[PDB]
């Protein structure tokens, strides 16, 4: 669920997830996809495409189990959809951390998104 | 839609809507309802109950027309559902503005929603 996702992002980046990625660029946050503004935005692009492949569980609402082991996100076995969901969230958390070096606050807020260029199909 | 709602909140409060209310308390932004933490939170509680009365349109995606007349949100004549939807959004924007005096930053970027007490029926 959003709770686990946010927790992962905090654990990897050390940043408050809502504050930094709540509405970042054309792909981070509520709404759909759009042409990526930068590398960070592209992380969320991939993430939303990752969600599209899921069946059997709700990516926004459904809780799952994961652990923080030697500062690594380790997805619990859960079930098929929940584990795949967990791996989606782990991937974007890692991706966001790896692209902190080009994070730009000018993409942080907000109004942008409906005017974004339409995204390629996943 | 989300765009009209966000614009209304900005117009009334003068505040960045996603920033101030994206994850505020148990009722503002993402997720469902919960036991409200304060007056601002109650606005969002009422808002989501307002959405339940809606029959035929999508509060998240369906756009509607409104205008800014004498610094007042004025819902334009669309179909019945879109009119009710517009009035739901107008009400919460006004309510959030009215309760800026007790807005508490501690409730802001603080995803506490899974810990919220179960909301009573609308
Ligand atoms: C549009 C972002 C803030 C929404 C707050 C609420 O009406 O739930």
UniProtKB/Swiss-Prot annotation, chains A, B:
SUPFAM superfamilies: Phospholipase A2, PLA2 (SSF48619). Residues 105-118 are annotated as: Important for membrane-damaging activities in eukaryotes and bacteria. It is found in: Secreted. GO terms for biological process: arachidonate secretion; defense response to bacterium; defense response to fungus; killing of cells of another organism; lipid catabolic process; negative regulation of T cell proliferation; phospholipid metabolic process. Disulfide bonds join 26-116, 28-44, 43-95, 49-122, 50-88, 57-81, 75-86. Keywords: Antibiotic, Antimicrobial, Disulfide bond, Fungicide, Myotoxin, Neurotoxin, Postsynaptic neurotoxin, Secreted, Toxin. The record marks 112, 115 as: Hydrophobic membrane-disruption site (MDiS). Expressed by the venom gland. Lacks hemorrhagic, anticoagulant and coagulant activities. Homodimer; non-covalently linked (probable alternative/compact dimer conformation). Belongs to the phospholipase A2 family. Group II subfamily. K49 sub-subfamily. Snake venom phospholipase A2 (PLA2) homolog that lacks enzymatic activity. Shows high myotoxin activities. Also shows neurotoxicity, since it induces muscle paralysis when tested on mouse phrenic-diaphragm preparations. Displays edema-inducing activities. Also displays antimicrobial activity against E.coli and C.albicans, as well as antitumoral activity against some human and mice cell lines. In addition, it is effective as parasiticidal agent against Leishmania sp. and S.mansoni. This is Basic phospholipase A2 homolog myotoxin II. It comes from Bothrops moojeni (Lance-headed viper).
């Amino acid at each position: 669920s959003l709770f686990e996702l946010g927790k992962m992002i905090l654990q990897e980046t050390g940043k408050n997830p809502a504050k930094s990625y709540g509405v970042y660029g054309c792909n981070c946050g509520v709404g759909g996809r759009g042409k990526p503004k930068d590398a960070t935005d592209r992380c969320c692009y991939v993430h939303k495409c990752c969600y599209k492949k899921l069946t059997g569980c709700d990516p926004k609402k459904d809780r799952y189990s994961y652990s923080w082991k030697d500062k690594t996100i380790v997805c619990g076995e859960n079930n098929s959809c929940l584990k795949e969901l967990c791996e989606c969230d782990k991937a974007v958390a890692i991706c966001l951390r790896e692209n902190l070096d080009t994070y730009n606050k000018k993409y942080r807020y907000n109004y942008l998104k409906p005017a974004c260029k339409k995204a390629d199909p996943c």
